[PDB]
């Protein structure tokens, strides 16, 4: 609710959909963010997507067809740069 | 003081990004 962290993995040889590697909330979410930054994993703020995925998905699952492109757009930007 | 378990740390290390609100 207050704080959300969703980890995203991606490998196109396995499926065209991104894969959710973690879902944490509140204080644990804040620790995920700090560690991610410390170990050089990009942390991207997108408040509506974070909520969406939290409300629709369980951890260790592929993003459903409905939200695939909204998630993939982030990976594509990070690749463009 | 460690907040995260080993498996969560690994999951983070194995991700392309973390999406947050």
Annotation keywords:
heterodimer, A: 81 residues, alpha+beta, name from scop, 3-stranded antiparallel beta sheet, B: 21 residues, flat, Surface presentation of antigens protein SpaS (chain B)
If you had to describe this structure to a student in words, what would you say it looks like?
Chain A: It comes from Shigella flexneri. Chain A: It is found in: Cell inner membrane. The complex is a heterodimer of chains A (81) and B (21). Chain A is built from 3 helices and 4 strands; from the N terminus they run E-E-H-E-H-E-H. Chain A is of the alpha+beta class and 81 residues long. Chain A has a single domain, classed as secretion proteins EscU (name from scop, 3-Layer(aba) Sandwich). Chain A has a 3-stranded antiparallel beta sheet with strand order 1-2-4. Chain A starts with a strand and ends with a helix. Chain B is α+β, with helices and mostly antiparallel strands. Chain B is 38% helix and 19% strand. Chain B has 1 helix and 1 strand, in the order αβ. The longest helix of chain B has 8 residues. Chain B is flat, with a radius of gyration of 10 Å. At the A-B interface, strand 1, strand 2, helix 1, strand 3 and helix 2 of A face helix 1 and strand 1 of B.
Put the structure in a nutshell.
Chain A is of the alpha+beta class and 81 residues long.
Write the layout of secondary structure elements.
The complex is a heterodimer of chains A (81) and B (21).
Chain A (H helix, E strand, L loop, with lengths): L3 E6 L9 E7 H13 L4 E3 L1 H10 L4 E2 L5 H13 L1
Antiparallel strand pairs in A: 1-2, 2-4
Chain B lengths: L5 H8 L3 E4 L1
């Amino acid at each position: 609710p207050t704080h959300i962290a969703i980890g995203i993995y991606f490998n196109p040889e396995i499926a065209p959909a991104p894969f959710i590697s973690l879902i944490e909330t509140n204080q644990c979410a804040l620790a995920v963010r700090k560690y991610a930054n410390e170990v050089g994993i990009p942390t991207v703020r997108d408040v509506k997507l974070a909520r969406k995925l939290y409300k629709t998905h369980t951890k260790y699952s592929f993003v459903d067809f409905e939200h695939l492109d909204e998630v993939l757009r982030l990976i594509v930007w990070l690749e463009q740069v | 003081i460690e907040i995260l378990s080993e498996q969560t740390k690994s999951d983070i290390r194995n991700s392309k990004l973390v999406v947050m609100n």
